[PDB]
């Protein structure tokens, strides 16, 4: 009855949304009572007929920020940086710029003062162009006052955490972070030998779409991973104490809330809500205006533990993909939903919420 019931519940949550959004392929992984459960739907590639499995690689877009946060959490534990450091402390090129007056925490939590959603199209994947971009940038408003969701913001945070560790960001993820987390199906640059696992992404008129190079891509949106590996990452988040101390502490650092905007508490990478909360409120927290518009923050008196009866989540998209991850620390429950179409966040959250509410019922 239990396996039948879980299958029935996940099918009932996924299938209508998959169909309504014409999603070619979709992978679900659920961590429940200390055990993983995988559900795979449809096609990784419509053209060659490869089916989705729990090992299929999907682009996870902005979910990458949680890995980026974990690297920064590590740097914090290596006493290599502090959240209250000025950004320019970690890149001499920034000394004398406005980044003298902006903290690593401001950068990590999108409150640096109006850094935009993306780098302008004129900024290529080029260290000098990136450096020059930040040198010339001026805040629209005071640092620490307004949240404006931003790839350049947390991208810089990740880049400076890597600088504090004395190695390139990409090398650190591949050589240290992913191995420390036990992740062998998680990549910034998918190896040729693994390309057969990499799903095709689909956009309008089913044009094929995979993510191309961009400035600070690895930091903001560049990770490709499987449902099985992303769930392993969720289980690491549920049980940091199962890893060696330095990496336990790194994960813990991403479970700390610094301010609220409406129902959402902003951590490093992770965004948190009280649990339970209505589907409509969770949808609103992950809505377009939350990503695209500035919001005045309500700063907490002290960092808040993001644990117990809370839902921690992150959405992520690329041109061709749509990912969502959610977990409830106090219930030892986690879920991953990866699709090879960018479909609205509200729809991803709807699937997740249907699964979570069915599990409690
Ligand atoms: C994350 O997936 N990003 C950044 C931002 N996230 O807002 S959210 O509510 O979707 O998580 C916007 C979309 C996405 C992003 O950076 N997409 C880019 C499209 C163009 N190619 C580079 C990735």
Short mmCIF file of C-alpha atoms and ligand atoms in Angstrom, two decimals:
data_model
loop_
_atom_site.label_atom_id
_atom_site.label_comp_id
_atom_site.label_asym_id
_atom_site.label_seq_id
_atom_site.Cartn_x
_atom_site.Cartn_y
_atom_site.Cartn_z
CA UNK A 1 0.00 0.00 0.00
CA UNK A 2 2.76 2.55 0.89
CA UNK A 3 4.69 2.31 -2.41
CA UNK A 4 1.41 2.31 -4.37
CA UNK A 5 0.18 5.34 -2.36
CA UNK A 6 3.40 7.33 -2.88
CA UNK A 7 3.43 6.54 -6.62
CA UNK A 8 -0.28 7.48 -6.79
CA UNK A 9 0.36 10.78 -4.97
CA UNK A 10 3.43 11.81 -7.01
CA UNK A 11 1.73 10.83 -10.33
CA UNK A 12 -1.37 12.87 -9.31
CA UNK A 13 0.76 15.93 -8.46
CA UNK A 14 3.07 15.73 -11.52
CA UNK A 15 1.05 14.44 -14.49
CA UNK A 16 -1.55 17.28 -14.79
CA UNK A 17 1.14 19.96 -14.44
CA UNK A 18 3.51 18.16 -16.85
CA UNK A 19 0.71 17.96 -19.41
CA UNK A 20 -0.65 21.50 -18.89
CA UNK A 21 2.85 22.96 -19.33
CA UNK A 22 3.86 20.58 -22.18
CA UNK A 23 6.94 19.47 -20.22
CA UNK A 24 8.78 16.79 -22.27
CA UNK A 25 10.60 15.23 -19.29
CA UNK A 26 10.53 15.58 -15.53
CA UNK A 27 12.37 13.94 -12.64
CA UNK A 28 11.18 13.88 -9.00
CA UNK A 29 13.25 12.75 -6.04
CA UNK A 30 11.88 12.64 -2.51
CA UNK A 31 13.75 12.02 0.72
CA UNK A 32 11.30 10.56 3.22
CA UNK A 33 12.05 8.91 6.60
CA UNK A 34 15.75 8.59 5.67
CA UNK A 35 15.10 6.87 2.31
CA UNK A 36 15.21 8.21 -1.28
CA UNK A 37 12.32 7.73 -3.72
CA UNK A 38 12.59 8.48 -7.42
CA UNK A 39 9.88 9.13 -10.02
CA UNK A 40 10.81 9.72 -13.65
CA UNK A 41 8.50 10.97 -16.39
CA UNK A 42 8.74 11.36 -20.15
CA UNK A 43 11.68 12.22 -22.35
CA UNK A 44 15.12 13.77 -21.81
CA UNK A 45 15.23 14.22 -25.61
CA UNK A 46 12.15 14.23 -27.84
CA UNK A 47 14.37 13.80 -30.92
CA UNK A 48 16.44 10.73 -29.91
CA UNK A 49 13.93 9.23 -27.45
CA UNK A 50 16.17 9.13 -24.37
CA UNK A 51 13.94 8.77 -21.34
CA UNK A 52 14.28 10.63 -18.05
CA UNK A 53 15.89 8.63 -15.26
CA UNK A 54 17.12 9.70 -11.79
CA UNK A 55 20.61 9.98 -13.38
CA UNK A 56 19.54 12.34 -16.23
CA UNK A 57 21.40 15.68 -16.01
CA UNK A 58 19.19 18.79 -15.94
CA UNK A 59 20.17 22.42 -15.79
CA UNK A 60 19.17 23.76 -12.37
CA UNK A 61 19.77 27.48 -13.06
CA UNK A 62 19.53 29.62 -9.90
CA UNK A 63 19.42 26.56 -7.63
CA UNK A 64 23.19 26.78 -8.28
CA UNK A 65 23.23 29.68 -5.76
CA UNK A 66 22.80 27.14 -2.93
CA UNK A 67 26.04 25.41 -3.99
CA UNK A 68 27.68 28.82 -4.32
CA UNK A 69 26.45 29.61 -0.78
CA UNK A 70 27.99 26.31 0.46
CA UNK A 71 31.41 27.27 -0.94
CA UNK A 72 31.12 30.65 0.78
CA UNK A 73 30.03 28.86 4.00
CA UNK A 74 33.25 26.84 3.72
CA UNK A 75 35.39 30.01 3.28
CA UNK A 76 33.69 31.42 6.38
CA UNK A 77 34.78 28.26 8.34
CA UNK A 78 38.33 28.44 6.99
CA UNK A 79 38.47 31.93 8.61
CA UNK A 80 39.26 33.25 5.11
CA UNK A 81 36.44 35.81 5.06
CA UNK A 82 33.65 37.22 7.24
CA UNK A 83 30.15 38.27 6.17
CA UNK A 84 30.88 41.82 7.39
CA UNK A 85 34.04 42.17 5.24
CA UNK A 86 33.95 44.94 2.61
CA UNK A 87 33.82 43.34 -0.83
CA UNK A 88 36.93 45.19 -2.01
CA UNK A 89 38.97 43.46 0.75
CA UNK A 90 39.08 40.35 -1.45
CA UNK A 91 39.77 41.94 -4.86
CA UNK A 92 42.32 44.81 -5.10
CA UNK A 93 40.79 45.79 -8.46
CA UNK A 94 37.71 46.92 -6.51
CA UNK A 95 39.59 49.12 -4.03
CA UNK A 96 38.53 52.75 -4.46
CA UNK A 97 35.19 51.71 -5.99
CA UNK A 98 31.75 51.69 -4.34
CA UNK A 99 32.51 48.13 -3.19
CA UNK A 100 34.55 49.72 -0.37
CA UNK A 101 31.15 50.42 1.21
CA UNK A 102 29.39 47.12 0.48
CA UNK A 103 29.64 43.96 2.61
CA UNK A 104 29.88 40.33 1.53
CA UNK A 105 26.54 39.79 3.23
CA UNK A 106 24.95 42.63 1.18
CA UNK A 107 26.19 40.86 -1.97
CA UNK A 108 25.08 37.39 -0.86
CA UNK A 109 21.55 38.57 -0.04
CA UNK A 110 20.92 41.00 -2.96
CA UNK A 111 20.93 44.16 -0.78
CA UNK A 112 24.09 45.81 -2.19
CA UNK A 113 21.91 48.64 -3.55
CA UNK A 114 20.35 47.76 -6.90
CA UNK A 115 22.75 45.46 -8.71
CA UNK A 116 20.55 44.26 -11.63
CA UNK A 117 19.01 40.85 -12.28
CA UNK A 118 21.67 40.08 -14.91
CA UNK A 119 24.89 41.54 -16.17
CA UNK A 120 24.13 43.74 -19.21
CA UNK A 121 24.44 41.91 -22.58
CA UNK A 122 27.56 44.00 -23.20
CA UNK A 123 29.44 42.22 -20.39
CA UNK A 124 30.98 39.02 -21.76
CA UNK A 125 32.51 36.09 -19.85
CA UNK A 126 35.77 38.02 -19.43
CA UNK A 127 37.52 38.90 -16.17
CA UNK A 128 38.42 42.44 -17.31
CA UNK A 129 34.88 43.23 -18.49
CA UNK A 130 33.52 41.84 -15.22
CA UNK A 131 36.09 43.84 -13.18
CA UNK A 132 35.32 47.01 -15.16
CA UNK A 133 31.56 46.48 -14.73
CA UNK A 134 31.82 46.49 -10.91
CA UNK A 135 34.33 49.37 -10.92
CA UNK A 136 31.86 51.61 -12.77
CA UNK A 137 28.63 50.51 -11.00
CA UNK A 138 26.87 52.96 -8.61
CA UNK A 139 24.15 51.95 -6.09
CA UNK A 140 20.60 53.16 -6.75
CA UNK A 141 19.97 53.24 -3.00
CA UNK A 142 21.75 52.62 0.31
CA UNK A 143 23.34 49.18 0.77
CA UNK A 144 21.38 46.97 3.21
CA UNK A 145 18.01 48.66 2.57
CA UNK A 146 16.47 46.94 -0.47
CA UNK A 147 16.48 43.43 -1.87
CA UNK A 148 16.82 43.24 -5.65
CA UNK A 149 17.40 39.66 -6.78
CA UNK A 150 20.69 39.67 -8.70
CA UNK A 151 23.09 37.31 -10.50
CA UNK A 152 25.91 39.94 -10.44
CA UNK A 153 25.35 40.35 -6.65
CA UNK A 154 25.67 36.74 -5.44
CA UNK A 155 28.00 36.03 -8.40
CA UNK A 156 30.46 38.55 -6.92
CA UNK A 157 29.90 36.99 -3.46
CA UNK A 158 30.87 33.54 -4.86
CA UNK A 159 33.80 34.98 -6.83
CA UNK A 160 35.21 36.73 -3.75
CA UNK A 161 34.76 33.60 -1.57
CA UNK A 162 36.92 31.77 -4.16
CA UNK A 163 39.47 34.58 -4.12
CA UNK A 164 39.60 34.34 -0.30
CA UNK A 165 40.44 30.65 -0.74
CA UNK A 166 43.13 31.42 -3.34
CA UNK A 167 41.67 29.26 -6.14
CA UNK A 168 39.26 29.72 -9.07
CA UNK A 169 35.57 29.27 -8.15
CA UNK A 170 35.03 26.57 -10.81
CA UNK A 171 38.08 24.56 -9.69
CA UNK A 172 36.93 24.73 -6.05
CA UNK A 173 33.45 23.35 -6.90
CA UNK A 174 34.85 20.49 -9.01
CA UNK A 175 37.86 19.54 -6.87
CA UNK A 176 36.55 20.25 -3.34
CA UNK A 177 32.83 21.07 -2.94
CA UNK A 178 31.15 18.43 -5.15
CA UNK A 179 33.46 15.59 -3.92
CA UNK A 180 33.01 16.65 -0.25
CA UNK A 181 29.24 16.32 -0.77
CA UNK A 182 29.62 12.92 -2.49
CA UNK A 183 28.32 14.24 -5.79
CA UNK A 184 29.63 12.41 -8.86
CA UNK A 185 26.76 13.42 -11.19
CA UNK A 186 27.06 17.19 -10.59
CA UNK A 187 28.96 19.42 -13.02
CA UNK A 188 29.69 22.95 -14.07
CA UNK A 189 31.21 21.62 -17.31
CA UNK A 190 29.60 18.28 -18.28
CA UNK A 191 32.34 15.80 -19.30
CA UNK A 192 32.15 14.44 -22.85
CA UNK A 193 31.77 10.94 -21.38
CA UNK A 194 28.59 12.06 -19.56
CA UNK A 195 26.91 13.97 -22.42
CA UNK A 196 24.56 11.04 -23.13
CA UNK A 197 23.00 11.81 -19.69
CA UNK A 198 22.43 15.53 -20.42
CA UNK A 199 18.77 16.26 -21.22
CA UNK A 200 17.80 18.57 -24.07
CA UNK A 201 16.09 21.80 -23.00
CA UNK A 202 13.04 23.09 -24.87
CA UNK A 203 11.67 26.59 -25.39
CA UNK A 204 9.03 28.20 -27.60
CA UNK A 205 8.19 26.20 -30.71
CA UNK A 206 10.21 23.45 -28.99
CA UNK A 207 13.50 25.03 -30.07
CA UNK A 208 16.42 23.22 -28.38
CA UNK A 209 18.06 25.18 -25.58
CA UNK A 210 21.10 24.57 -23.41
CA UNK A 211 22.88 27.14 -21.25
CA UNK A 212 25.76 28.98 -22.90
CA UNK A 213 28.73 30.74 -21.28
CA UNK A 214 28.13 34.03 -19.41
CA UNK A 215 29.91 36.26 -16.85
CA UNK A 216 29.93 34.49 -13.44
CA UNK A 217 27.66 31.74 -14.85
CA UNK A 218 29.06 29.06 -12.51
CA UNK A 219 28.21 31.14 -9.43
CA UNK A 220 24.69 32.18 -10.44
CA UNK A 221 23.08 29.53 -12.65
CA UNK A 222 25.61 27.09 -14.15
CA UNK A 223 25.20 23.73 -12.35
CA UNK A 224 23.92 20.62 -14.19
CA UNK A 225 22.93 17.68 -11.97
CA UNK A 226 20.68 14.67 -11.67
CA UNK A 227 17.61 14.28 -9.49
CA UNK A 228 19.54 11.64 -7.47
CA UNK A 229 22.53 13.96 -6.91
CA UNK A 230 20.39 17.01 -6.08
CA UNK A 231 18.54 14.89 -3.50
CA UNK A 232 21.90 13.79 -2.02
CA UNK A 233 22.62 17.54 -1.68
CA UNK A 234 19.20 17.97 0.03
CA UNK A 235 20.01 15.11 2.43
CA UNK A 236 23.35 16.80 3.23
CA UNK A 237 21.30 19.93 4.05
CA UNK A 238 18.92 17.86 6.23
CA UNK A 239 21.83 16.20 8.07
CA UNK A 240 24.99 18.36 7.98
CA UNK A 241 26.30 16.45 11.02
CA UNK A 242 26.80 13.41 8.75
CA UNK A 243 29.68 15.20 6.98
CA UNK A 244 33.15 15.99 8.30
CA UNK A 245 33.16 19.09 10.51
CA UNK A 246 34.41 21.69 7.99
CA UNK A 247 31.65 20.76 5.51
CA UNK A 248 29.01 20.36 8.23
CA UNK A 249 29.79 23.95 9.29
CA UNK A 250 29.70 25.08 5.61
CA UNK A 251 26.17 23.70 5.21
CA UNK A 252 25.02 25.17 8.57
CA UNK A 253 26.10 28.62 7.28
CA UNK A 254 23.42 28.39 4.55
CA UNK A 255 20.76 27.74 7.24
CA UNK A 256 20.82 31.27 8.72
CA UNK A 257 18.26 34.00 7.99
CA UNK A 258 19.25 37.68 7.88
CA UNK A 259 16.04 39.61 7.03
CA UNK A 260 12.47 39.11 5.83
CA UNK A 261 10.54 40.33 2.82
CA UNK A 262 6.86 39.48 3.45
CA UNK A 263 6.60 35.76 4.28
CA UNK A 264 10.15 34.98 3.08
CA UNK A 265 13.31 34.85 5.25
CA UNK A 266 16.50 35.25 3.19
CA UNK A 267 19.46 32.99 3.96
CA UNK A 268 22.63 32.32 1.97
CA UNK A 269 21.17 30.84 -1.23
CA UNK A 270 18.19 29.28 0.61
CA UNK A 271 14.92 31.19 1.09
CA UNK A 272 12.72 30.15 4.02
CA UNK A 273 9.03 30.19 5.05
CA UNK A 274 7.11 29.20 8.15
CA UNK A 275 5.58 25.72 7.70
CA UNK A 276 2.73 25.12 7.18
CA UNK A 277 1.77 28.13 5.03
CA UNK A 278 -0.80 28.37 2.20
CA UNK A 279 0.09 27.36 -1.37
CA UNK A 280 -0.78 30.89 -2.55
CA UNK A 281 1.71 32.49 -0.10
CA UNK A 282 4.52 30.09 -1.13
CA UNK A 283 3.68 30.87 -4.77
CA UNK A 284 3.76 34.63 -4.06
CA UNK A 285 7.20 34.22 -2.45
CA UNK A 286 8.49 32.64 -5.67
CA UNK A 287 6.61 34.98 -8.03
CA UNK A 288 7.96 37.18 -10.83
CA UNK A 289 7.80 40.47 -8.86
CA UNK A 290 9.97 38.86 -6.12
CA UNK A 291 12.63 38.19 -8.76
CA UNK A 292 12.23 41.44 -10.73
CA UNK A 293 11.30 44.24 -8.32
CA UNK A 294 13.03 45.83 -5.30
CA UNK A 295 11.58 45.22 -1.83
CA UNK A 296 12.43 46.99 1.42
CA UNK A 297 13.81 44.47 3.90
CA UNK A 298 12.88 43.89 7.55
CA UNK A 299 16.22 43.18 9.19
CA UNK A 300 16.36 40.63 12.00
CA UNK A 301 17.92 41.64 15.37
CA UNK A 302 20.23 38.63 15.00
CA UNK A 303 20.74 35.77 12.48
CA UNK A 304 17.91 33.26 12.75
CA UNK A 305 18.30 29.47 12.63
CA UNK A 306 16.44 28.18 9.56
CA UNK A 307 15.40 24.83 11.03
CA UNK A 308 12.44 23.09 12.69
CA UNK A 309 8.98 23.89 11.25
CA UNK A 310 10.11 25.78 8.15
CA UNK A 311 10.23 25.16 4.44
CA UNK A 312 13.53 26.09 2.76
CA UNK A 313 13.51 26.37 -1.01
CA UNK A 314 15.04 27.68 -4.18
CA UNK A 315 13.67 27.99 -7.72
CA UNK A 316 15.97 27.99 -10.73
CA UNK A 317 15.56 28.37 -14.50
CA UNK A 318 17.52 28.58 -17.71
CA UNK A 319 16.20 29.24 -21.25
CA UNK A 320 15.37 25.52 -21.58
CA UNK A 321 14.92 24.23 -17.99
CA UNK A 322 12.91 24.69 -14.80
CA UNK A 323 14.04 23.39 -11.38
CA UNK A 324 12.67 23.55 -7.85
CA UNK A 325 14.03 22.27 -4.55
CA UNK A 326 12.30 22.29 -1.14
CA UNK A 327 12.96 20.73 2.24
CA UNK A 328 11.54 20.81 5.78
CA UNK A 329 14.37 20.46 8.33
CA UNK A 330 12.10 19.56 11.30
CA UNK A 331 10.40 16.77 9.34
CA UNK A 332 13.50 15.22 7.65
CA UNK A 333 11.69 15.62 4.32
CA UNK A 334 13.09 16.89 1.04
CA UNK A 335 12.10 17.08 -2.61
CA UNK A 336 13.58 17.89 -5.99
CA UNK A 337 11.63 18.59 -9.22
CA UNK A 338 13.64 18.98 -12.43
CA UNK A 339 12.12 19.66 -15.84
CA UNK A 340 13.47 20.28 -19.34
CA UNK A 341 11.12 23.21 -19.99
CA UNK A 342 11.21 26.60 -18.24
CA UNK A 343 7.62 26.60 -16.91
CA UNK A 344 6.21 29.10 -14.38
CA UNK A 345 7.51 28.94 -10.75
CA UNK A 346 3.90 28.82 -9.47
CA UNK A 347 3.45 25.51 -11.31
CA UNK A 348 6.62 23.96 -9.80
CA UNK A 349 5.47 25.04 -6.35
CA UNK A 350 2.00 23.57 -7.01
CA UNK A 351 3.54 20.12 -7.70
CA UNK A 352 5.75 20.37 -4.57
CA UNK A 353 2.83 21.50 -2.38
CA UNK A 354 0.57 18.68 -3.61
CA UNK A 355 3.31 16.15 -2.68
CA UNK A 356 3.99 17.74 0.75
CA UNK A 357 0.31 18.01 1.73
CA UNK A 358 -0.34 14.43 0.55
CA UNK A 359 2.59 13.24 2.69
CA UNK A 360 1.19 14.90 5.82
CA UNK A 361 -2.26 13.48 5.00
C1 LIG B 1 17.93 31.66 -11.85
O1 LIG B 1 17.47 30.58 -12.21
N1 LIG B 1 18.03 32.77 -12.64
C2 LIG B 1 18.16 34.09 -12.05
C3 LIG B 1 16.77 34.67 -11.89
N2 LIG B 1 16.12 33.71 -11.00
O2 LIG B 1 14.80 34.18 -10.63
S1 LIG B 1 13.84 32.87 -10.36
O3 LIG B 1 12.69 33.30 -9.58
O4 LIG B 1 13.66 32.23 -11.65
O5 LIG B 1 14.77 31.85 -9.50
C4 LIG B 1 16.12 34.77 -13.25
C5 LIG B 1 16.15 33.48 -14.08
C6 LIG B 1 17.43 32.65 -13.97
C7 LIG B 1 18.51 33.09 -14.93
O6 LIG B 1 19.55 33.65 -14.58
N3 LIG B 1 18.24 32.77 -16.24
C8 LIG B 1 19.18 33.10 -17.30
C9 LIG B 1 18.52 33.12 -18.66
C10 LIG B 1 19.51 33.55 -19.73
N4 LIG B 1 20.66 32.65 -19.73
C11 LIG B 1 21.31 32.67 -18.42
C12 LIG B 1 20.35 32.14 -17.36
#
